[PDB]
Design an enzyme around this catalytic site. Sequence first.
Site, PDB file in Angstrom:
ATOM      1  N   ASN A 190      26.911  -0.633  -9.570  1.00 20.80           N
ATOM      2  CA  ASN A 190      26.348  -0.008  -8.381  1.00 20.80           C
ATOM      3  C   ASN A 190      24.817  -0.128  -8.318  1.00 20.80           C
ATOM      4  O   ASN A 190      24.182   0.576  -7.527  1.00 20.80           O
ATOM      5  CB  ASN A 190      26.798   1.446  -8.250  1.00 20.80           C
ATOM      6  CG  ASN A 190      26.390   2.284  -9.429  1.00 20.80           C
ATOM      7  OD1 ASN A 190      25.811   1.792 -10.408  1.00 20.80           O
ATOM      8  ND2 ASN A 190      26.719   3.556  -9.370  1.00 20.80           N
ATOM      9  N   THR A 238       0.785  -1.230   0.000  1.00 19.25           N
ATOM     10  CA  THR A 238       0.000   0.000   0.000  1.00 19.25           C
ATOM     11  C   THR A 238       0.843   1.321   0.000  1.00 19.25           C
ATOM     12  O   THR A 238       0.765   2.110  -0.933  1.00 19.25           O
ATOM     13  CB  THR A 238      -1.057  -0.119   1.107  1.00 19.25           C
ATOM     14  OG1 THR A 238      -2.103  -1.008   0.639  1.00 19.25           O
ATOM     15  CG2 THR A 238      -1.679   1.216   1.387  1.00 19.25           C
ATOM     16  N   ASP A 281      26.851   2.474 -16.024  1.00 20.85           N
ATOM     17  CA  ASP A 281      28.115   2.804 -15.347  1.00 20.85           C
ATOM     18  C   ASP A 281      29.103   3.563 -16.253  1.00 20.85           C
ATOM     19  O   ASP A 281      29.259   3.233 -17.445  1.00 20.85           O
ATOM     20  CB  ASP A 281      28.847   1.544 -14.906  1.00 20.85           C
ATOM     21  CG  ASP A 281      28.104   0.756 -13.818  1.00 20.85           C
ATOM     22  OD1 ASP A 281      27.059   1.229 -13.289  1.00 20.85           O
ATOM     23  OD2 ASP A 281      28.587  -0.365 -13.509  1.00 20.85           O
ATOM     24  N   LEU A 311      21.266   2.605 -13.917  1.00 23.25           N
ATOM     25  CA  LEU A 311      21.897   3.520 -14.868  1.00 23.25           C
ATOM     26  C   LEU A 311      23.254   3.022 -15.347  1.00 23.25           C
ATOM     27  O   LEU A 311      24.014   2.369 -14.631  1.00 23.25           O
ATOM     28  CB  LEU A 311      22.091   4.922 -14.252  1.00 23.25           C
ATOM     29  CG  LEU A 311      20.888   5.523 -13.472  1.00 23.25           C
ATOM     30  CD1 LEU A 311      21.322   6.881 -12.894  1.00 23.25           C
ATOM     31  CD2 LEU A 311      19.725   5.695 -14.444  1.00 23.25           C
TER      32      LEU A 311
HETATM   33  C1  LIG Z   1      14.100   7.529 -11.423  1.00 19.22           C
HETATM   34  O1  LIG Z   1      13.938   8.944 -11.434  1.00 19.22           O
HETATM   35  C2  LIG Z   1      14.679   9.600 -10.415  1.00 19.22           C
HETATM   36  C3  LIG Z   1      14.339  11.099 -10.363  1.00 19.22           C
HETATM   37  O2  LIG Z   1      14.881  11.660 -11.557  1.00 19.22           O
HETATM   38  C4  LIG Z   1      16.175   9.365 -10.665  1.00 19.22           C
HETATM   39  O3  LIG Z   1      16.848   9.616  -9.459  1.00 19.22           O
HETATM   40  C5  LIG Z   1      17.802  10.667  -9.515  1.00 19.22           C
HETATM   41  O4  LIG Z   1      19.039  10.135  -9.921  1.00 19.22           O
HETATM   42  C6  LIG Z   1      20.017  11.143 -10.091  1.00 19.22           C
HETATM   43  C7  LIG Z   1      21.283  10.527 -10.703  1.00 19.22           C
HETATM   44  O5  LIG Z   1      21.662   9.395  -9.930  1.00 19.22           O
HETATM   45  C8  LIG Z   1      20.284  11.823  -8.745  1.00 19.22           C
HETATM   46  O6  LIG Z   1      21.229  12.841  -8.959  1.00 19.22           O
HETATM   47  C9  LIG Z   1      22.078  13.059  -7.819  1.00 19.22           C
HETATM   48  O7  LIG Z   1      21.640  14.192  -7.066  1.00 19.22           O
HETATM   49  C10 LIG Z   1      22.365  14.460  -5.875  1.00 19.22           C
HETATM   50  C11 LIG Z   1      21.641  15.562  -5.095  1.00 19.22           C
HETATM   51  O8  LIG Z   1      20.680  14.830  -4.371  1.00 19.22           O
HETATM   52  C12 LIG Z   1      19.781  15.560  -3.502  1.00 19.22           C
HETATM   53  O9  LIG Z   1      18.938  16.496  -4.165  1.00 19.22           O
HETATM   54  C13 LIG Z   1      17.880  15.985  -4.968  1.00 19.22           C
HETATM   55  C14 LIG Z   1      17.089  17.148  -5.570  1.00 19.22           C
HETATM   56  O10 LIG Z   1      16.224  17.758  -4.624  1.00 19.22           O
HETATM   57  C15 LIG Z   1      16.977  15.043  -4.166  1.00 19.22           C
HETATM   58  O11 LIG Z   1      16.020  14.468  -5.022  1.00 19.22           O
HETATM   59  C16 LIG Z   1      17.792  13.929  -3.511  1.00 19.22           C
HETATM   60  O12 LIG Z   1      16.925  13.084  -2.760  1.00 19.22           O
HETATM   61  C17 LIG Z   1      17.511  11.777  -2.530  1.00 19.22           C
HETATM   62  O13 LIG Z   1      18.141  11.688  -1.267  1.00 19.22           O
HETATM   63  C18 LIG Z   1      17.257  12.063  -0.215  1.00 19.22           C
HETATM   64  C19 LIG Z   1      18.038  12.218   1.080  1.00 19.22           C
HETATM   65  O14 LIG Z   1      19.048  11.227   1.112  1.00 19.22           O
HETATM   66  C20 LIG Z   1      16.073  11.088  -0.112  1.00 19.22           C
HETATM   67  O15 LIG Z   1      15.073  11.616   0.723  1.00 19.22           O
HETATM   68  C21 LIG Z   1      15.421  10.861  -1.475  1.00 19.22           C
HETATM   69  O16 LIG Z   1      14.553   9.755  -1.361  1.00 19.22           O
HETATM   70  C22 LIG Z   1      16.461  10.655  -2.589  1.00 19.22           C
HETATM   71  O17 LIG Z   1      17.101   9.403  -2.375  1.00 19.22           O
HETATM   72  C23 LIG Z   1      17.305   8.623  -3.571  1.00 19.22           C
HETATM   73  O18 LIG Z   1      18.352   9.136  -4.405  1.00 19.22           O
HETATM   74  C24 LIG Z   1      19.703   9.016  -3.953  1.00 19.22           C
HETATM   75  C25 LIG Z   1      20.658   9.666  -4.964  1.00 19.22           C
HETATM   76  O19 LIG Z   1      20.481  11.076  -4.984  1.00 19.22           O
HETATM   77  C26 LIG Z   1      19.995   7.534  -3.667  1.00 19.22           C
HETATM   78  O20 LIG Z   1      21.335   7.322  -3.271  1.00 19.22           O
HETATM   79  C27 LIG Z   1      18.987   7.023  -2.621  1.00 19.22           C
HETATM   80  O21 LIG Z   1      19.145   5.659  -2.381  1.00 19.22           O
HETATM   81  C28 LIG Z   1      17.565   7.169  -3.163  1.00 19.22           C
HETATM   82  O22 LIG Z   1      17.424   6.284  -4.266  1.00 19.22           O
HETATM   83  C29 LIG Z   1      18.978  14.508  -2.708  1.00 19.22           C
HETATM   84  O23 LIG Z   1      18.554  14.977  -1.440  1.00 19.22           O
HETATM   85  C30 LIG Z   1      23.825  14.770  -6.220  1.00 19.22           C
HETATM   86  O24 LIG Z   1      24.562  14.800  -5.027  1.00 19.22           O
HETATM   87  C31 LIG Z   1      24.447  13.719  -7.168  1.00 19.22           C
HETATM   88  O25 LIG Z   1      25.643  14.257  -7.696  1.00 19.22           O
HETATM   89  C32 LIG Z   1      26.835  13.444  -7.499  1.00 19.22           C
HETATM   90  O26 LIG Z   1      27.301  12.854  -8.711  1.00 19.22           O
HETATM   91  C33 LIG Z   1      27.438  13.893  -9.700  1.00 19.22           C
HETATM   92  C34 LIG Z   1      27.499  13.374 -11.138  1.00 19.22           C
HETATM   93  O27 LIG Z   1      26.859  14.367 -11.917  1.00 19.22           O
HETATM   94  C35 LIG Z   1      28.553  14.912  -9.366  1.00 19.22           C
HETATM   95  O28 LIG Z   1      28.523  15.993 -10.276  1.00 19.22           O
HETATM   96  C36 LIG Z   1      28.316  15.481  -7.965  1.00 19.22           C
HETATM   97  O29 LIG Z   1      29.460  16.175  -7.503  1.00 19.22           O
HETATM   98  C37 LIG Z   1      27.967  14.357  -6.981  1.00 19.22           C
HETATM   99  O30 LIG Z   1      29.152  13.607  -6.794  1.00 19.22           O
HETATM  100  C38 LIG Z   1      29.605  13.831  -5.453  1.00 19.22           C
HETATM  101  O31 LIG Z   1      28.882  13.033  -4.517  1.00 19.22           O
HETATM  102  C39 LIG Z   1      28.979  11.649  -4.792  1.00 19.22           C
HETATM  103  C40 LIG Z   1      27.929  10.901  -3.975  1.00 19.22           C
HETATM  104  O32 LIG Z   1      27.907  11.441  -2.670  1.00 19.22           O
HETATM  105  C41 LIG Z   1      30.422  11.237  -4.500  1.00 19.22           C
HETATM  106  O33 LIG Z   1      30.587   9.880  -4.832  1.00 19.22           O
HETATM  107  C42 LIG Z   1      31.421  12.060  -5.341  1.00 19.22           C
HETATM  108  O34 LIG Z   1      32.734  11.787  -4.881  1.00 19.22           O
HETATM  109  C43 LIG Z   1      31.117  13.580  -5.418  1.00 19.22           C
HETATM  110  O35 LIG Z   1      31.658  14.337  -4.352  1.00 19.22           O
HETATM  111  C44 LIG Z   1      23.503  13.278  -8.317  1.00 19.22           C
HETATM  112  O36 LIG Z   1      23.421  14.201  -9.390  1.00 19.22           O
HETATM  113  C45 LIG Z   1      18.983  12.346  -8.120  1.00 19.22           C
HETATM  114  O37 LIG Z   1      19.197  12.734  -6.763  1.00 19.22           O
HETATM  115  C46 LIG Z   1      17.930  11.232  -8.101  1.00 19.22           C
HETATM  116  N1  LIG Z   1      16.668  11.745  -7.562  1.00 19.22           N
HETATM  117  C47 LIG Z   1      15.833  11.048  -6.808  1.00 19.22           C
HETATM  118  C48 LIG Z   1      14.590  11.786  -6.360  1.00 19.22           C
HETATM  119  O38 LIG Z   1      16.036   9.877  -6.466  1.00 19.22           O
HETATM  120  C49 LIG Z   1      16.450   7.894 -10.963  1.00 19.22           C
HETATM  121  O39 LIG Z   1      17.766   7.703 -11.414  1.00 19.22           O
HETATM  122  C50 LIG Z   1      15.487   7.270 -11.934  1.00 19.22           C
HETATM  123  N2  LIG Z   1      15.804   5.862 -11.980  1.00 19.22           N
HETATM  124  C51 LIG Z   1      15.987   5.254 -13.157  1.00 19.22           C
HETATM  125  C52 LIG Z   1      16.339   3.787 -13.133  1.00 19.22           C
HETATM  126  O40 LIG Z   1      15.838   5.843 -14.228  1.00 19.22           O
HETATM  127 CA   LIG Z   2      25.093   2.064 -12.631  1.00 12.94          CA
HETATM  128 ZN   LIG Z   3      -3.579  -4.833   2.164  1.00 17.52          ZN
END
Ligand SMILES: *[C@@H]1O[C@H](CO)[C@@H](O[C@@H]2O[C@H](CO)[C@@H](O[C@@H]3O[C@H](CO[C@H]4O[C@H](CO)[C@@H](O)[C@H](O[C@H]5O[C@H](CO)[C@@H](O)[C@H](O)[C@@H]5O[C@H]5O[C@H](CO)[C@@H](O)[C@H](O)[C@@H]5O)[C@@H]4O)[C@@H](O)[C@H](O[C@H]4O[C@H](CO)[C@@H](O)[C@H](O)[C@@H]4O[C@H]4O[C@H](CO)[C@@H](O)[C@H](O)[C@@H]4O)[C@@H]3O)[C@H](O)[C@H]2NC(C)=O)[C@H](O)[C@H]1NC(C)=O
Ligand SMILES: [Ca+2]
Ligand SMILES: [Zn+2]
Length: 800
Positions: free
Chosen positions: A680, A156, A686, A684
């Site tokens: 990872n 749900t 790699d 997406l």
């Molecule tokens: C489905 O659709 C969704 C939505 O489009 C896609 O997910 C997106 O994927 C993007 C690419 O992976 C990702 O982009 C990252 O954004 C980071 C900023 O994140 C914050 O801000 C956004 C915007 O408001 C917010 O949405 C995020 O929310 C996540 O985290 C919070 C708190 O933890 C949770 O409440 C929330 O549920 C959500 O979690 C989910 O996403 C994260 C990843 O963000 C997962 O790990 C969780 O498990 C969960 O699934 C955030 O609050 C930004 O930091 C990233 O940038 C890194 O890499 C880039 C490359 O361009 C680099 O330029 C940057 O410097 C940075 O690297 C640095 O940090 C690295 C990691 O710490 C480190 O290794 C390096 O050394 C560097 O220092 C990145 O751009 C985007 O956040 C999510 N959005 C959501 C909502 O999930 C998804 O991919 C689609 N799926 C498919 C299969 O298509």
């Molecule tokens: Ca990957």
């Molecule tokens: Zn039920």
Amino acid sequence: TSGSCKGRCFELQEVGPPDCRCDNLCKSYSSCCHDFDELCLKTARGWECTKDRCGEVRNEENACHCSEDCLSRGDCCTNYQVVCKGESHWVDDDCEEIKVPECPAGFVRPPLIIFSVDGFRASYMKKGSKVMPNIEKLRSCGTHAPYMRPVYPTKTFPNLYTLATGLYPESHGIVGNSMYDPVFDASFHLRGREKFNHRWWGGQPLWITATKQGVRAGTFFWSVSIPHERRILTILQWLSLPDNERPSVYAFYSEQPDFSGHKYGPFGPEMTNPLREIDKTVGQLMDGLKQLRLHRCVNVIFVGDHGMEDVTCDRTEFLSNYLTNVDDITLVPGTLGRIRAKSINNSKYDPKTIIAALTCKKPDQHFKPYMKQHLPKRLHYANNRRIEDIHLLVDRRWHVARKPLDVYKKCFFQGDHGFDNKVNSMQTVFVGYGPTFKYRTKVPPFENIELYNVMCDLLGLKPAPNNGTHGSLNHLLRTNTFRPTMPDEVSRPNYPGIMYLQSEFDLGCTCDDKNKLEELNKRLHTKGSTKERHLLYGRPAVLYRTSYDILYHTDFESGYSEIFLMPLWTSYTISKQAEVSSIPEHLTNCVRPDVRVSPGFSQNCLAYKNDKQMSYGFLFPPYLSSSPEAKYDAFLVTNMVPMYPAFKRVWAYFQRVLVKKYASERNGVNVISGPIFDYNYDGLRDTEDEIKQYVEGSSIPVPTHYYSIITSCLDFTQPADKCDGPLSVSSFILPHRPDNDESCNSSEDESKWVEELMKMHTARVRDIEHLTGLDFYRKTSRSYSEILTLKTYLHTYESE
Ligand SMILES: *[C@@H]1O[C@H](CO)[C@@H](O[C@@H]2O[C@H](CO)[C@@H](O[C@@H]3O[C@H](CO[C@H]4O[C@H](CO)[C@@H](O)[C@H](O[C@H]5O[C@H](CO)[C@@H](O)[C@H](O)[C@@H]5O[C@H]5O[C@H](CO)[C@@H](O)[C@H](O)[C@@H]5O)[C@@H]4O)[C@@H](O)[C@H](O[C@H]4O[C@H](CO)[C@@H](O)[C@H](O)[C@@H]4O[C@H]4O[C@H](CO)[C@@H](O)[C@H](O)[C@@H]4O)[C@@H]3O)[C@H](O)[C@H]2NC(C)=O)[C@H](O)[C@H]1NC(C)=O
Ligand SMILES: [Ca+2]
Ligand SMILES: [Zn+2]
Ligand SMILES: O=C(CCc1c[nH]c(=O)o1)N1C[C@H]2CCN(C(=O)c3cc(OCC4CCOCC4)nc(C4CC4)c3)CC[C@H]2C1
Ligand SMILES: [Cl-]
Ligand SMILES: [K+]
Ligand code: NA
Ligand code: NA
């Protein structure tokens, strides 16, 4: 609780403690004002008008009114005009196409009402149709799908929140009804207060998307003790507010039929009554809309979160029957299993040995264990720290539990849900009815991750980034369609000619290989002469920065990566007539240098010889070569990919037997195959620095998966290469694994288990696009929206 609810009933903006609340969620928080019950949940006199109640003098103690001012006030009982004005029930009116919104002056857009029903199994539309006349009228007059696919797990909270955000559970964060987040060190449960905390809930749900863009939202949530009739009247009342205060989006939620289905099973005889009751509630909504003259103005969505399966306690597998150490594990139990260490101080705890103790141990085992990264990619259920490394996929109709005590100390229940989202009984409903929806239109099944986008379209909102493919549901809509453009190609290919002599290659490869008509012939094949046969929909676009070459051949074309040292994609067409041959003896271990590709960008046979675990296979199957001469192309080092011997069994049967079988059944097929690297497990592609494994002593990276996209004519009377209309597709993302532990019958013949493994790993083309950074179907004669629908299609392999 000291302040008052006077004139504040169901306040749209909630208020901050310690001031008492009158919001439709205050009960759930024990923060309601002292007088909430008397003022806001009135019940006096019932829910309907009678003959004698008509034109009465307004009595504020009543539930709803039958006086004459009531319409302006917005609070008549929903059947008022029927009993006191000779009107008919909405259900009794013939349907008339709604060509344009027919809205009162002052409405800037058609309101949207989302009516969600928990556990409304897709077959209830057919099987319960006699007892649901309002729902049947919405369905047959509006737009409907035969069913809608939920997300995994089919629970749900994950589904309601996907509906709200357009995100997979792994991205929005609500990955189950029950969760542990190791970073917060906190637990999320159905019962209790932690679920209210904002840090659980990711993405951007529709009500927040509305607000940020100036569209006002009614509150989506309802305390379970507010009766359904009161929810309907509240929405009708909000709809009567002045223009500047009146919300544009509304949600009603029903706990039924889920509540009853748990007790009685999806088709228990007791199930008829809740179905009638839901229908009567819809009836009331539509009657109420019609009185306010809003019944041809509002878009109504009737949507379920998941279906319901027959499940009883005698159908429980116990981990205590497999594991000696049951007490060192924590199990999230039921229709899915998630396992972690009971204590992180336990350094003896080992997921590999737990998995091994859980693998194919009983002849009819009703669950299958996985490392979460090995789960079918179509479930998108790995990239979240709240998802345990060990997952149990449970057979439909079954439960998994830790020990027998859990089950008889916590046969009551006959229905449950949560299983794989491809399961027939988990499928739910979608109906759209209103000015923006099409009239009497059936659409194909689609996934609920697509709706958020459509709800943004229906309200004129820009969607937050999400997992829907925006445009793929344009065919549900009369207008407000979203017309996307294809993404721009980021890298253009090179087209290398012959640039290298055989002797520059020191690859440790060998091959037993050894006329002007036929020489001009061969050169043109290498120049791309047959490319229109094998590349039917254009070459895929590379959507990222990389160096790659297009290589043409008689029987296939490929886009060869200089970075990963193998094709990103290989494309070929197999007609119905085509013949399977076998690899000639003199060529069994033949690998040939590709004089178009530098030794430095080529794989080598030595690495494979040295690597005791890794072998190799071919993307274009040598079995399907059009001639003995053309077959030499299939042995080029640029057609080669790393494969574990266990996986070669799978691949070889797919290439030697199944490709031709599909070409027989489908009247020719076009195939695109290639490698996927997702170390990872984020779904997406790699980059090269994320690759965790290479063939021993080389720079040859090892894929995590192999994909194939198999395309043909929807009208199978036309051959795949001469198709005049819509296309038909099925695809797969096969895990590239060093054993066949996933298939319990794998020591038998490939014909008894391979096709079943492939069905388990069925994929959307869109899944393969995320995993590879490629964009397919660039040059068809079809509309782009139709191509998006095709890319989101999932072939499920479930019966009718
Ligand atoms: C489905 O659709 C969704 C939505 O489009 C896609 O997910 C997106 O994927 C993007 C690419 O992976 C990702 O982009 C990252 O954004 C980071 C900023 O994140 C914050 O801000 C956004 C915007 O408001 C917010 O949405 C995020 O929310 C996540 O985290 C919070 C708190 O933890 C949770 O409440 C929330 O549920 C959500 O979690 C989910 O996403 C994260 C990843 O963000 C997962 O790990 C969780 O498990 C969960 O699934 C955030 O609050 C930004 O930091 C990233 O940038 C890194 O890499 C880039 C490359 O361009 C680099 O330029 C940057 O410097 C940075 O690297 C640095 O940090 C690295 C990691 O710490 C480190 O290794 C390096 O050394 C560097 O220092 C990145 O751009 C985007 O956040 C999510 N959005 C959501 C909502 O999930 C998804 O991919 C689609 N799926 C498919 C299969 O298509
Ligand atoms: Ca990957
Ligand atoms: Zn039920
Ligand atoms: O009692 C239960 C569930 C018990 C149960 C049985 N089987 C199972 O999985 O759970 N609940 C008691 C509660 C009952 C009231 N709820 C809501 O107000 C609600 C609505 C809701 O709509 C979202 C819209 C989005 C647009 O498209 C239509 C749906 N989003 C939520 C949460 C996700 C934010 C809660 C239902 C959930 C609770 C869960
Ligand atoms: Cl769960
Ligand atoms: K080897
Ligand atoms: Na707009
Ligand atoms: Na096996």
